[PDB]
C-alpha cells in the first residue's frame, strides 16, 4: 500500500543527498556489484605504485545469489593518496567507473572469484595470513578458503575446493571471527544457540574436514554475532536474540556457563565490537535502535547510550585509527558515526533534533538495508559499505568534521 | 559464436542478473532517472559551485587537490549533520520548490526566487501525444516507455498510455515522468 | 534484440536498448546501467567532453 510513498521518500532523500554531498564527503565512490554482498572487509595489505597518486587496496566480497553460482570475491579498490588530483563539485553521472570523487583511476576491478556453495553470509580473513579466508554458508558447515591455492578465474567445473571444511553446527548463522593473537583459532556463531570453536593451525594437511574443538551452549535464543578480544587471546564476547551479552573465557573448564552475563538491551542484539585501543571498552547494537557502550571492568552499569537510529542495528565497528570513533548500521538506510569524546558536550538548542552531541556524521548513501561495512586499516577514516541494493560504496567523510582547528 | 560475441554475451548476462534484482532495479531508478520537473532542481549548476565561487571568486579551478578542498570547506563553515530532521526539512523545501514550479507552468507567478536553481529555463509543461518515460508501479513493476494522453493540472498528475501491450492506461504524477524527445527550456518570463 | 565482428551488440531488456560493443569483459556494471538508462542512441560520439572553457 505504502510501497509507493516509501519508494518516493527514499528517492527524494537520495537525490537530496546526492545534491548536497560535496560539503559532507572528501571522497565517495558508488560502485554497483553483480550480486549483493552480506559482507565486506578491507584486506590489510596496501601497495603504492611509484609516482602514482593512488594506492591499490583490496576488499573481500561475497555474493547473495538466488540459486545459481555464488562466489567469494576479492576486489581491488584503488584509492587516492594525499597528493590526489580530482574534483568535488558533484558526483559525476558521466564517467564509467563510479559516483564521482577521488582519483580518475578509482575503479573497482575484480581479481579473484572462487566457487562457493550457497550465498556467502560472512567472510573474515585470518590476521596472521591474509591468504586464508573463512566463509559462512547458509548450510550447516563453515568453510575456510585460501585464495593462493585457487585460479584467479574460477573453473566452470563448479567444484568448491576449500582448504578446510569445518563442521560442528546444525543450522546457519552470521557470527564469525578469528582470534587476532593466536593463529588458526576461529569462532563461529549459528542459529543452533551454540558457539562452536575451531582451531586450524593444528589440523592435518590430509584431513579436509575438521571437527569443532569445543562447543559453547550458553545462549538459549538465536546467536547473532561473536568476537574475540583484541588484546586478550583467551577472552571473547557474544550477543544473541536473548538480549544477553555474555563474556566467555577459554581457560574456563566450564564451556556451558559464561564468565559474565548481561541483559544489555530490551530487544534483539545483532552485533558487538571490542575497542582496539582500550582493552576495557566494547559496544553493541541492537533491535531497540540503541547502541550500548560498555566497560569491561563493571558489567552492571551501561557506560553510555546512543540513539537516533530509526530502525534495527546489524553492525558496529570501532575505528582502527581513533579509539573514540565507531560506526553502526542496520535496517534503517543510514550509517551513523559516533564520537566518544563528545559525550556530555552542550550543543546548540536546535541541533538536538539532528541527534545527540556525539553523533558525528550520518551516511545517507544507501537505498536499502546496509548489510555490512568495514574501516580501511591503512588509510584513516575510509569506509566501504555494501547494501542489499547491489551497491558497494567506499567513502571518506569531509575533513573538517573531525578536525577542530 | 565468436570470442567477442561470447564475451559481450557475458556482459549481457551480467546485466540481466543485475536487473533481476528488484532492489537493484529500484536503485537504477533512483540514481539516474530524473523527471523533467526534478532535473532543473539538481542537474544544473548546483549550489556548491555557486557558493564556492562567491566565497572565492579568486579561486581559479573547480577541481584540485583534496588538501585544498580542506581549506575551501573550512572557509565555508561546518556542514550540518544530515539526519532525519535534515531530510524532512529538505523534503519540505523540495515540496515548496516543486510547488513553485507547478505554479510556474500554469502561466503564473511564483516565489521571490532566491534559489540558485532554475534561473529562467523552467521545464515546459507536457504536450498531449508525445512519448514519455515513466515508472509504473504495481503488478507490473519497473520503468517503462509510453505515450501521454492527458493533463491533470489541479493535482499535477498525468494520464499515460504505454507502448507495452497488456499494460494499458494509468495515471502517473508529474515528478515520475521523463520526456525522451530533446529537453525544452523556455524563460520564466514566458511562464509569467 | 539484434544479436551481433563485435561491430554492435544490442540486447532488448525491459523495453530498453544498450550497445554492448563498447564494453569489454573487464568493465564494471555502473557504466552499463547508466547506458541502459540512456536508451542507447545511434552514436557514441564523445563522453561529455572533458574540455572546459570555464574561467576562474
Q: Are A72 and A114 within 8 A, CB to CB?
A: yes
Question: Inter-chain contact C30–A30, Cβ cutoff 8 Å?
Answer: yes
Distance CA B147, CA A129 (A): 60
Question: Inter-chain contact B144–C18, Cβ cutoff 8 Å?
Answer: no
CB within 8 Å of B117: residues ≥ 6 apart:
B40, B41, B42, B44, B46, B47, B97
Q: Which of B185, B141, B136 is nearest to B37 (CA)?
A: B185
Selected residue of C25, C30, C31, C48 to mutate for chain A interface (largest A Cβ count, 10 A): C30
- Residue spans per domain, chain C: 1-43
Distance CA A374, CA A383 (A): 6
DSSP state, residue C5: -
Nearest to A355 among B14, B78, B83 (CB): B83
Cross-strand bridge partners of residue A235: A249
Distance CA A64, CA A67 (A): 9
Q: Are strands A123-126 and A142-146 parallel, antiparallel or unpaired?
A: unpaired
C27 CB neighbours in chain A (<8 A) are 96
Query: What is the enclosing helix (H) or strand (E) of C13?
Result: strand C10-13
For A267, counting Cβ atoms within 10 Å of its Cβ (0-12 exposed, 13-18 middle, 19+ buried), the class is middle
Question: Inter-chain contact C32–B61, Cβ cutoff 8 Å?
Answer: no
**A311, closest residue in chain B (CA to CA):** B84
Q: Are A216 and A236 within 8 A, CB to CB?
A: no
Q: Resolution to 1 decimal, in Å?
A: 3.5
CA distances from B179 to B126, B132, B147 (A): 8, 4, 10
Q: Are A65 and A142 within 8 A, CB to CB?
A: no
Question: Inter-chain contact C28–A94, Cβ cutoff 8 Å?
Answer: no
Q: What are phi and psi of A255, to 5 degrees?
A: -90, -5
Secondary structure, 3-state, chain A: CCHHHHHHHHHHHHHHHHHCHHHHEEEEEEEECCCCCCCCEECCCCECCCCCCEEECCEEEECCCCCCCEEEEEEECEEECCCCCEECCCCCCCCCCCCCCCCCCCCCEEEEEEEECCCCCCEEEECCEEEEEEEECCCCCEEEEECCCCCCCCCCCCCCCCCEEECCCCCCCCCEEECCCCCCEEEEECCCCCEEEEECCCCCCCCCEECCCEEECCCCCCEEEEEECCCCCCEEEEEECCCEEEEEECCCCCCCCCCEEEECCCCCEEEEEECCCCCCEEEEEECCCCEEEEECCECCCCCEEECCCCCCCCEEEECCCCCCEEEEECCCCCEEEEEHHHCCCCCCCHHHCCCCCCEEEEECCCCCCEEEEEECCCCCCCEEEEECCCEEEEEEECHHHHCCC
Question: Inter-chain contact A362–B81, Cβ cutoff 8 Å?
Answer: yes
For A89, counting Cβ atoms within 10 Å of its Cβ (0-12 exposed, 13-18 middle, 19+ buried), the class is middle
Q: Which of A206, A137, A197, A203 is nearest to A173 (CA)?
A: A137
A100 CB neighbours in chain B (<8 A) are none
Q: Are A220 and A246 within 8 A, CB to CB?
A: no
CA–centroid distance for A142 within its chain: 18
Distance CA A304, CA A291 (A): 9
Largest CA distance in chain A: 66
- The C-alpha of B154 sits at a distance from chain C's nearest C-alpha, in angstroms, of 30
Nearest to B24 among A19, A390, A399 (CB): A390
> A399: left (phi > 0), else alpha (psi -120 to 50), else beta?
alpha
Query: What is the enclosing helix (H) or strand (E) of C19?
Result: strand C16-19
CA–centroid distance for A257 within its chain: 28
Q: What are phi and psi of A228, to 5 degrees?
A: -75, 160
Question: Inter-chain contact A108–C28, Cβ cutoff 8 Å?
Answer: yes
Positive/negative CA dihedral, A198, A201, A204, A208: positive
> A315: left (phi > 0), else alpha (psi -120 to 50), else beta?
beta
Distance CA C14, CA B142 (A): 8
DSSP state, residue C2: -
CA–centroid distance for A232 within its chain: 21
Q: Are B144 and C15 within 8 A, CB to CB?
A: yes
Distance CA B71, CA B50 (A): 17
Q: CB contact, 8 Å: C30 with chain A?
A: yes
Q: CB contact, 8 Å: C54 with chain A?
A: no
Q: Are A357 and A343 within 8 A, CB to CB?
A: yes
Distance CA A23, CA A89 (A): 9
Cross-strand bridge partners of residue A119: none
- DSSP 3-state percent helix, strand, coil across chain C (nearest 5): 25, 15, 60
Q: Are A309 and A289 within 8 A, CB to CB?
A: yes
Could you give the dihedral angle defined by the CA atoms of residues B107, B111, B114 and B118, in that order, rounded to the nearest 10 degrees?
A: -30
**C30, closest residue in chain A (CA to CA):** A32
User: Does the structural domain B33-191 have CATH classification 2.30.30.140?
Assistant: yes
Number of C-beta neighbours around residue B108 at 10 A: 10
**B74, closest residue in chain A (CA to CA):** A400
Secondary structure, 3-state, chain B: CCHHHHHHHHHHHHHHHHHCCHHHHHHHHHHHCCCCCCHHHHCCCCHHHHHHHHHCCCCCCCEECHHHHHHHHHCCCCCCCCCHHHHHHHHHHHHHHHHHHHHHCCCCCCCCCCCCCCCCCEECCCCCCCEEEEEECCCCCEEEEEEEEEEECCCCEEEEEECCCCCCEEEEEHHHEEECCCCCEECHHHHC
Domain limits for position A395: 1-405
Spell out which chain B residues touch chain C, with contact meaning CB-CB distance below 8 angstroms. Answer: 2, 4-5, 7-8, 10-12, 14-16, 18-19, 28, 31-33, 57-62, 133, 142-145, 163-164, 180
Distance CA A170, CA A177 (A): 18
Q: Are A22 and A89 within 8 A, CB to CB?
A: yes
Question: Inter-chain contact A390–B21, Cβ cutoff 8 Å?
Answer: yes
Query: What is the enclosing helix (H) or strand (E) of C40?
Result: none
Distance CA A270, CA A243 (A): 9
CB within 8 Å of A404: residues ≥ 6 apart:
none
Q: What are phi and psi of B175, to 5 degrees?
A: -90, 25
Distance CA B126, CA B134 (A): 13
Distance CA A309, CA A318 (A): 17
Selected residue of C23, C28, C44 to mutate for chain A interface (largest A Cβ count, 10 A): C28
Q: Are A354 and B86 within 8 A, CB to CB?
A: yes
**A391, closest residue in chain C (CA to CA):** C30
For A249, counting Cβ atoms within 10 Å of its Cβ (0-12 exposed, 13-18 middle, 19+ buried), the class is middle
Distance CA B21, CA B32 (A): 17
Q: What are phi and psi of B88, to 5 degrees?
A: -70, -35
Question: Inter-chain contact B33–C37, Cβ cutoff 8 Å?
Answer: yes
Q: Which other chains touch chain C, taking contact as 3+ CB pairs less than 8 Å apart?
A: A, B
Q: Are strands A209-210 and A164-166 parallel, antiparallel or unpaired?
A: parallel
Amino acid at each position: 500500500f505504502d510501497d509507493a510513498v516509501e519508494e518516493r521518500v527514499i528517492n527524494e532523500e537520495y537525490k537530496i543527498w546526492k545534491k548536497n554531498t560535496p560539503f559532507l564527503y572528501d571522497l565517495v565512490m558508488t560502485h554497483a556489484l553483480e550480486w549483493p554482498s552480506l559482507t565486506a572487509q578491507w584486506l590489510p595489505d596496501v601497495t603504492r605504485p611509484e609516482g602514482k597518486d593512488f594506492s591499490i587496496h583490496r576488499l573481500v566480497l561475497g555474493t547473495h545469489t538466488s540459486d545459481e553460482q555464488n562466489h567469494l570475491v576479492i576486489a581491488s579498490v584503488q584509492l587516492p593518496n594525499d597528493d590526489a588530483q580530482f574534483d568535488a563539485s558533484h558526483y559525476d553521472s558521466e564517467k564509467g567507473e563510479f559516483g564521482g570523487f577521488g582519483s580518475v583511476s578509482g575503479k573497482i576491478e575484480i581479481e579473484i572469484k572462487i566457487n562457493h556453495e550457497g550465498e556467502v553470509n560472512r567472510a573474515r580473513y585470518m590476521p596472521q595470513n591474509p591468504c586464508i579466508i573463512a566463509t559462512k554458508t547458509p548450510s550447516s558447515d563453515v568453510l575456510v578458503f585460501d585464495y593462493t591455492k585457487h585460479p584467479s578465474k574460477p573453473d566452470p567445473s563448479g567444484e568448491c575446493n576449500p582448504d578446510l571444511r569445518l563442521r560442528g553446527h546444525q543450522k546457519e548463522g552470521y557470527g564469525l571471527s578469528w582470534n587476532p593473537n593466536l593463529s588458526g583459532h576461529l569462532l563461529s556463531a549459528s542459529d543452533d544457540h551454540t558457539i562452536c570453536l575451531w582451531d586450524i593451525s593444528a589440523v592435518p594437511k590430509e584431513g579436509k574436514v575438521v571437527d569443532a574443538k569445543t562447543i559453547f551452549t550458553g545462549h538459549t535464543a538465536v546467536v547473532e554475532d561473536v568476537s574475540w578480544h583484541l588484546l586478550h587471546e583467551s577472552l571473547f564476547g557474544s550477543v544473541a536474540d536473548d538480549q544477553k551479552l555474555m563474556i566467555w573465557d577459554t581457560r574456563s573448564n566450564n564451556t556451558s556457563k559464561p564468565s559474565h552475563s548481561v541483559d544489555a538491551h530490551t530487544a534483539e542484539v545483532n552485533c558487538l565490537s571490542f575497542n582496539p585501543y582500550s582493552e576495557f571498552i566494547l559496544a553493541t547494537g541492537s533491535a531497540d535502535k540503541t547502541v550500548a557502550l560498555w566497560d569491561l571492568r563493571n558489567l552492571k552499569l551501561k557506560l553510555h547510550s546512543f540513539e537516533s537510529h530509526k530502525d534495527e542495528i546489524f553492525q558496529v565497528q570501532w575505528s582502527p585509527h581513533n579509539e573514540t570513533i565507531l560506526a553502526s548500521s542496520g535496517t534503517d538506510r543510514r550509517l551513523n558515526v559516533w564520537d566518544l569524546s563528545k559525550i556530555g558536550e552542550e550543543q546548540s538548542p536546535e541541533d538536538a533534533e539532528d541527534g545527540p552531541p556525539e553523533l558525528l556524521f550520518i551516511h545517507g548513501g544507501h537505498t536499502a538495508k546496509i548489510s555490512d561495512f568495514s574501516w580501511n586499516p591503512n588509510e584513516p577514516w575510509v569506509i566501504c559499505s555494501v547494501s542489499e541494493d547491489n551497491i558497494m560504496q567506499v567513502w571518506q567523510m569531509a575533513e573538517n568534521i573531525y578536525n577542530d582547528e | 559464436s565468436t570470442p567477442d560475441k561470447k564475451a559481450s554475451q557475458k556482459i549481457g548476462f551480467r546485466l540481466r542478473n543485475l536487473l533481476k534484482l528488484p532492489k537493484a532495479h529500484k536503485w537504477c531508478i533512483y540514481e539516474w532517472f530524473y523527471s523533467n520537473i526534478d532535473k532543473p532542481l539538481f542537474e544544473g549548476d548546483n549550489d556548491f559551485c555557486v557558493c564556492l565561487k562567491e566565497s572565492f571568486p579568486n579561486l581559479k579551478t573547480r577541481k584540485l587537490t583534496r588538501v585544498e578542498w580542506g581549506k575551501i570547506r573550512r572557509l565555508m563553515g561546518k556542514p550540518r549533520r544530515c539526519s532525519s530532521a535534515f531530510f524532512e526539512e529538505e523534503r519540505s523545501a523540495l515540496k515548496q520548490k516543486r510547488q513553485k514550479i507547478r505554479l510556474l507552468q500554469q502561466r503564473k507567478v511564483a516565489d521571490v526566487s532566491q534559489f540558485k536553481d532554475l534561473p529562467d529555463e523552467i521545464p515546459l509543461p507536457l504536450v498531449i501525444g508525445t512519448k514519455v518515460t515513466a515508472r509504473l508501479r504495481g503488478v507490473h513493476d519497473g520503468l517503462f516507455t509510453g505515450q501521454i494522453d492527458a493533463v491533470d493540472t489541479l493535482n499535477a498528475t498525468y494520464r499515460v498510455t504505454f507502448d507495452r501491450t497488456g499494460l494499458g492506461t494509468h495515471t502517473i504524477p508529474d515528478y515520475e515522468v521523463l520526456s525522451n524527445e530533446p529537453h525544452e527550456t523556455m524563460p520564466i518570463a514566458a511562464f509569467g | 534484440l539484434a544479436e551481433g565482428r563485435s561491430n554492435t551488440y544490442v540486447i532488448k531488456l525491459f523495453d530498453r536498448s544498450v550497445d554492448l560493443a563498447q564494453f569489454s569483459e573487464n568493465t564494471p556494471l555502473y557504466p552499463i546501467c547508466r547506458a541502459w538508462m540512456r536508451n542507447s542512441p545511434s552514436v557514441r560520439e564523445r563522453e561529455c567532453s572533458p574540455s572546459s572553457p570555464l574561467p576562474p
